[PDB]
Every structure is written in C-alpha cells, then in structure tokens.
C-alpha cells in the first residue's frame, strides 16, 4: 500500500515537496499519508495509498518519471505504514 | 507493405499536426533512403510542410529531376533554370523536356530545342521548329519518326 | 452519471492528508471536496451544494471535457484534474486563490488553449500540464511561462529567472 520513492531533487522544500507528490499520486487513488515521516528529503518519500491496486498501478506507470529535474525510483517499501 | 508502412507515418504525422517531429523526419529520410518514385517526392513535399531544399537532394540522388525542377520554381535565375535543363536533358520524358524548354524560354533555347527535336516527342519537335521559326528539319522530323515508331514498338512480364 | 447535489451529499468526506478540508460527493457518481474519482464526469456543475467548505477537489478519472461551470469558490486551493479528456479552459474561471492545478493526462492540444491560465491572478503558483499533447509542441515551456508568469514551479519543475529572460527574448 506503501510505496518507496528515491533519487529526488532534494533542494525542494518538505511542505512543497509533499503537496507535489500528493498531487501527483492523487490520481491513482486516494493518499493516505499527510507528511514525510522522514524529515530527511533525499529523494526518501513513502506515499500510502488507502487501496493496493492504487499503489501498483502508481509503481508501474510512474517508473522513472522526471520529477522537479530527476527521474523518480520507485519501489514497494519494505514494511507496512503504521497507519495502515 | 512498406509502403502502406510509410503511408501510415505519413498520415499519422498529418493528424498530429517539435523534436519527436524531427525524428518522424529522419524516419521518413531513412525510409526514403531505403527504398531510393513519386511516393518519395510525396514524402519529401510532406517534409517541406512540416518544417524543403532536400526535396532536390533526394531527386539528385535519384537522377525524376525535371519534376523537382518545376517544384523548384514553384518554391521560387538563368543559370540555374539552364543547369536544371541540362541535367534533365542528361536524364532524358517529353513533357519534362518541354517544361525545361518553356522554362529556358534566345539561341540557347533555339539549341534547346534542336537537341530536343534531335533526341508527344514529334509533335513537340514540330511546334519547336515552327517557333524558331516564327522567331535540316526535315532529317530531324523523320529521324523523330523513326523513334516515335520505336517508342511504339516499346509500350515476368514486365 | 452527472454532478448533482444528490451526489454532493454523501461521498467518502474526510481531510486531505495536507489537512485540507473538504467534504464529498458520492449518492452514486461522481464527487467534489475530496476524491471525484472513477465515476464518468462528463461536465463540471452543481458545484454550489459544496457551499465552499473545501481546499481541494481530487476530479482524476472522470470524463471532463473542459474546466468551465464553477461556482464562486473562496476556499478552493488545489483542483486535480488528472485523466481526464480536458480539451479546453473555460477562462472566467477565476476562483480567486487557485494556486494549484493538475491537469495531466488530458487532451489540450494548442498553446492558446492555455490562454486561460494567465487570467488566474497570482495564486496559481503550481500546474502540471505532463502528459498532454500540447506538450510536445516547440518552446511549450517558454511560452507557459511568457503567457502566466504567475507560475512558480511548472511541470514540477521551477520556473528560473533564465527562461523567464528566454521567454522574454521570445
């Protein structure tokens, strides 16, 4: 449900970077994630995603995908969100 | 086959309507390459209004020529109109050498014409000597008449 | 099948992650305040049963032909319009404090179809046209930018004063 992003253009700020990726990823279904837990940037964003069908369909058609300069690397995360 | 391929990119092309149009365009010159008629000059006005001087270049590496040549005035001197119908008189055909001579059109275009009486041909050759003279023609209308009953005799099986 | 206050009534209503506020529509269809999602939205209206009460409107997946038919929404921050088949932009849009608009994945064609998009004031600070048509044609994003300076980041990517002097040039 919880898919991992990596190889971002750090330099943008959290809250811009957030509401970026929610926009983005809205359109597969609906984000449940509000904000990076993280607080690290680096590319290193988890976005949950309140169906799985919507998260695989994310990972599959936004491999790669030039994202404020880079092309994004997405992968299924490791564990589950603890708000899943 | 392939020509129904280029067709395809062709029209595909038309209903898009700038850099992926640049490689449909070295596609298009590639398959142009490939094949080396009037599909490619069809493809090469298509290029001309995409983005058109390569509509002679193909036709010179074709040498054919006369039909770029009046694509050429069409898109715009003597001397060049003169190096043109040389060109097409090396690659001669009748109506292309008669474009050639009304271009050309004043002895170099009485010459013109007495090579092109020499080489709808007899009919041309008649009504070229009829305005030079308005301006050994007997020989040229029976030699004409000789290969007029060659060309007759021209037109797997193939 | 169509937006009718029906449907505004009862869509899974909640807050944006980004604790944007909102609250939506679904007897059936399609929705607004939150995820209008996958439900056939052929033309945008009914808009006033959302009364204002909401940041962000998640229209993706729906079958919008153009942007027009909005009601005076104050509170309406962010649209998401993605696949959608949005050939055009209304233009008297001007929901004052639009910064955010998503339109990828649809189906404008000509940069004068983005013409629109200068009338909203300074607010629309972020819009992604990626993958649209439009897209492709020559010095898109120079003429996004010459056409609505209003833009910050464009594409996700950021505006720069270079291009704006390159849109200037142009």
Same mark, same amino acid.
């Given at each position: 449900?919880?898919?991992?992003?990596?190889?971002?253009?750090?330099?943008?700020?959290?809250?811009?970077?957030?509401?970026?990726?929610?926009?983005?990823?809205?359109?597969?279904?609906?984000?449940?994630?509000?904000?990076?837990?993280?607080?690290?940037?680096?590319?290193?964003?988890?976005?949950?995603?309140?169906?799985?069908?919507?998260?695989?369909?994310?990972?599959?058609?936004?491999?790669?995908?030039?994202?404020?300069?880079?092309?994004?690397?997405?992968?299924?995360?490791?564990?589950?969100?603890?708000?899943? | 086959?392939?020509?129904?391929?280029?067709?395809?990119?062709?029209?595909?092309?038309?209903?898009?309507?700038?850099?992926?149009?640049?490689?449909?365009?070295?596609?298009?010159?590639?398959?142009?390459?490939?094949?080396?008629?009037?599909?490619?000059?069809?493809?090469?006005?298509?290029?001309?209004?995409?983005?058109?001087?390569?509509?002679?270049?193909?036709?010179?590496?074709?040498?054919?020529?006369?039909?770029?040549?009046?694509?050429?005035?069409?898109?715009?001197?003597?001397?060049?109109?003169?190096?043109?119908?040389?060109?097409?008189?090396?690659?001669?055909?009748?109506?292309?050498?008669?474009?050639?001579?009304?271009?050309?059109?004043?002895?170099?275009?009485?010459?013109?014409?007495?090579?092109?009486?020499?080489?709808?041909?007899?009919?041309?050759?008649?009504?070229?000597?009829?305005?030079?003279?308005?301006?050994?023609?007997?020989?040229?209308?029976?030699?004409?008449?000789?290969?007029?009953?060659?060309?007759?005799?021209?037109?797997?099986?193939? | 099948?169509?937006?009718?206050?029906?449907?505004?009534?009862?869509?899974?209503?909640?807050?944006?992650?980004?604790?944007?506020?909102?609250?939506?529509?679904?007897?059936?269809?399609?929705?607004?305040?939150?995820?209008?999602?996958?439900?056939?939205?052929?033309?945008?209206?009914?808009?006033?049963?959302?009364?204002?009460?909401?940041?962000?409107?998640?229209?993706?997946?729906?079958?919008?032909?153009?942007?027009?038919?909005?009601?005076?929404?104050?509170?309406?921050?962010?649209?998401?319009?993605?696949?959608?088949?949005?050939?055009?932009?209304?233009?008297?849009?001007?929901?004052?404090?639009?910064?955010?608009?998503?339109?990828?994945?649809?189906?404008?064609?000509?940069?004068?179809?983005?013409?629109?998009?200068?009338?909203?004031?300074? #607010?629309?600070?972020?819009? #992604?046209?990626?993958?649209?048509?439009?897209?492709?044609?020559?010095?898109?994003?120079?003429?996004?930018?010459?056409?609505?300076?209003?833009?910050? #980041?464009?594409?996700?990517?950021?505006?720069?004063?270079?291009?704006?002097?390159?849109?200037?040039?142009?």
């Amino acid at each position: 449900n919880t898919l991992y992003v990596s190889q971002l253009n750090e330099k943008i700020n959290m809250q811009r970077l957030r509401v970026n990726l929610f926009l983005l990823f809205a359109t597969f279904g609906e984000v449940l994630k509000v904000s990076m837990n993280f607080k690290k940037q680096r590319g290193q964003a988890f976005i949950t995603m309140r169906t799985i069908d919507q998260a695989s369909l994310a990972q599959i058609s936004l491999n790669g995908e030039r994202f404020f300069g880079k092309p994004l690397k997405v992968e299924f995360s490791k564990s589950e969100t603890k708000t899943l | 086959s392939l020509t129904q391929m280029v067709d395809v990119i062709e029209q595909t092309v038309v209903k898009y309507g700038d850099s992926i149009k640049l490689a449909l365009e070295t596609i298009l010159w590639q398959i142009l390459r490939k094949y080396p008629f009037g599909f490619w000059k069809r493809f090469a006005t298509i290029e001309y209004q995409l983005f058109i001087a390569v509509l002679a270049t193909s036709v010179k590496w074709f040498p054919l020529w006369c039909d770029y040549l009046n694509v050429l005035c069409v898109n715009n001197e003597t001397d060049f109109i003169r190096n043109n119908f040389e060109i097409a008189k090396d690659l001669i055909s009748h109506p292309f050498w008669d474009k050639f001579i009304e271009f050309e059109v004043w002895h170099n275009v009485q010459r013109i014409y007495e090579y092109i009486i020499e080489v709808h041909q007899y009919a041309r050759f008649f009504t070229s000597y009829k305005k030079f003279l308005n301006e050994i023609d007997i020989v040229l209308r029976k030699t004409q008449t000789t290969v007029n009953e060659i060309w007759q005799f021209e037109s797997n099986d193939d | 099948m169509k937006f009718t206050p029906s449907i505004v009534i009862d869509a899974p209503q909640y807050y944006v992650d980004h604790f944007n506020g909102k609250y939506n529509v679904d007897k059936c269809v399609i929705l607004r305040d939150l995820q209008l999602e996958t439900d056939s939205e052929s033309m945008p209206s009914s808009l006033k049963h959302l009364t204002k009460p909401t940041h962000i409107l998640d229209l993706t997946n729906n079958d919008l032909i153009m942007i027009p038919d909005l009601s005076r929404r104050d509170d309406i921050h962010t649209l998401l319009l993605g696949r959608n088949n949005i050939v055009e932009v209304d233009g008297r849009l001007l929901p004052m404090n639009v910064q955010n608009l998503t339109l990828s994945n649809n189906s404008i064609r000509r940069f004068e179809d983005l013409q629109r998009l200068r009338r909203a004031p300074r #607010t629309l600070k972020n819009l #992604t046209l990626i993958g649209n048509q439009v897209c492709h044609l020559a010095n898109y994003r120079e003429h996004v930018l010459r056409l609505v300076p209003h833009l910050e #980041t464009l594409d996700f990517q950021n505006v720069t004063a270079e291009e704006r002097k390159s849109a200037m040039s142009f």
